[PDB]
């Protein structure tokens, strides 16, 4: 629990959201409505999501007699367990332990938003906005940069906060691609989990572990048994075949030597296609 005391970063956060006069703002974790009332002026209908009924009672007390009294709903409970209604942009201050859930819940909405202005911890945001080859390019950046696009707005330094915390914060505009692209989710995530375990060792390193070859052997068997094509002779268990299979891909697409924390998104696509082409899937 911290309070954005600065009355001038609040206005800038709001008007960068480009609220149209026909929008449904979701506004997650409203606080004491230092920020909300601007959104009430600029949006047709606000849906604030809150967990502290003390704050909810005070916030709904704030709007009484005000002309905007009827354009605000409040949904209580845990944010990560509600059903959000349709909402059309999203503005968020919520305490940072939900910073990584929140993002993927917005990306995996049915009819996702169009723009969202989110507040994050500085190092978290700098994971999100890190291009291939930087020091901070992580697995999170490769996911989120596949399905969204993430752009810095400003630095919120730590002395605009009551009480002052220790970490610096950032304001970040996130905007979902539309249509979301037609690669799978679970195949994309399986591949990124494997190849980003050790970010700066080469890619063929990540396909040496014996947990991983067990996983891929199991998947390849279950794929053949999905198509009912009975199995040949393997010198160990089936991974034998898989082993040379993997090596062959890492010969052709050349990627078995580049280091996964320097390979941008088209390279992961080419690797995903090459494993799909020879009968490997990741979930």
């Amino acid at each position: 629990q911290h309070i954005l005391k600065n009355p001038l970063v609040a206005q800038g956060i709001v008007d960068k959201a480009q609220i149209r006069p026909s929008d449904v703002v979701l506004e997650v974790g409203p606080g004491t409505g230092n920020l909300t009332v601007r959104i009430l002026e600029q949006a047709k209908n606000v849906v604030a999501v809150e967990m502290d009924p003390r704050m909810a009672a005070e916030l709904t007390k704030r709007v009484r007699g005000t002309p905007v009294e009827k354009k605000l709903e409040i949904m209580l409970g845990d944010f990560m367990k509600t059903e959000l209604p349709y909402f059309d942009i999203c503005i968020s201050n919520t305490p940072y332990q939900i910073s990584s859930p929140l993002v993927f819940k917005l990306i995996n909405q049915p009819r996702p938003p169009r723009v969202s202005i989110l507040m994050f911890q500085r190092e978290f945001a700098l994971r999100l906005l890190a291009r291939p080859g930087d020091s901070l390019y992580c697995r999170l950046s490769a996911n989120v940069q596949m399905w969204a696009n993430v752009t810095h707005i400003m630095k919120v330094g730590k002395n605009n906060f009551r009480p002052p915390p220790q970490v610096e914060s950032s304001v970040v505009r996130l905007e979902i691609k539309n249509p979301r692209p037609q690669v799978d989710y679970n195949e994309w995530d399986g591949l990124l989990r494997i190849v980003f375990v050790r970010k700066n060792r080469t890619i063929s390193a990540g396909f040496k572990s014996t947990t991983v070859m067990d996983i891929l052997e199991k998947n390849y068997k279950t794929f053949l048994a999905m198509n009912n094509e009975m199995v040949d002779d393997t010198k160990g268990s089936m991974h034998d075949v898989v082993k040379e299979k993997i090596d062959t891909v890492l010969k052709e697409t050349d990627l078995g030597d580049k280091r996964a924390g320097k390979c941008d998104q088209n390279d992961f696509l080419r690797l995903l296609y090459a494993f799909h082409q020879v009968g490997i899937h990741f979930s």
């Binding site: 692209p181 037609q182 690669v183 080419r270 995903l272 296609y273 799909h276 082409q277």
Partner: peptide, 15 residues
């Protein structure tokens, strides 16, 4: 961007 789009079509092939 062009390269990306052609490969995503070829991945539609092997779903």
């Amino acid at each position: 961007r062009e390269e990306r789009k052609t490969i995503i079509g070829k991945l539609q092939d092997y779903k």
